[PDB]
Assembly symmetry: C2
Homo-oligomer: 131 residues x 2
């Protein structure tokens, strides 16, 4: 069925997107959440852990580990504001500027290898109509 085919392509497109993340995750040995945090940090600049929590869904039991790991991979570092102590500010580690460019270029590659298929899927999805 043509309508049914198009609707089912929602799942195909979702799969494309999760696959791209899978590719990044395996190459860079990071979690989905870590990748999203790094991207958000690059988009919005340094911020507190609490603030980042609003942009990226990190479940409480993996939170400490997630940020601690980003620190150990040397992607970020932490700062303690001198009049809050229980607030943690995170910053991109500029020493890893070249690695940042490399990662973004890899993500670009993974997107490019999927771009035609994703648009073809979205075309099928959007082509779904009433009957």
């Amino acid at each position: 069925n043509d309508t049914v085919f198009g609707i089912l392509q929602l799942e195909t497109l979702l799969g494309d997107i999760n696959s791209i993340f899978s590719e990044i995750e395996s190459e860079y040995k990071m979690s989905r959440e870590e990748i999203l945090i790094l991207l958000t940090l690059w988009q919005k600049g340094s911020m507190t852990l609490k603030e980042m929590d609003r942009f990226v869904e990190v479940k409480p039991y993996k939170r400490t580990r997630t940020y601690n790991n980003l620190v150990e991979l040397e992607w970020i570092y932490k700062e303690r504001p001198v009049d809050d102590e229980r607030t943690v500010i995170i910053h991109f580690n500029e020493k890893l500027q070249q690695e940042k460019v490399e990662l973004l270029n890899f993500i670009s590659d993974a997107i490019a290898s999927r771009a035609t298929a994703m648009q073809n899927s979205l075309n099928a999805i959007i082509a779904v109509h009433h009957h």
Copy 2:
């Protein structure tokens, strides 16, 4: 960042797709797996549970309730090939043909409301490039 914004739209498009499923789920009181099963059944025709499980990822612990609920909602019915196999064949309940059309139309409407947003997001994603 043009690149970073575009990569982050992967998650936006993902959210769009899952919000469609959420909307159907709340309207029709079904899980995503049930929706995918019905669609696959309409696409491919009658088949065994074993065959359906290879088309739609349904966690083993959820399988029995998933199909039983489709039977309770009267979307499908079960058959056992002779003499009485361990095999369960499921069929679409043709009595619900008009219901099928209305569900498909509902999903079509959900897709149409998001078509502009999804294509804009995919445009941002595919625009991602090297530097």
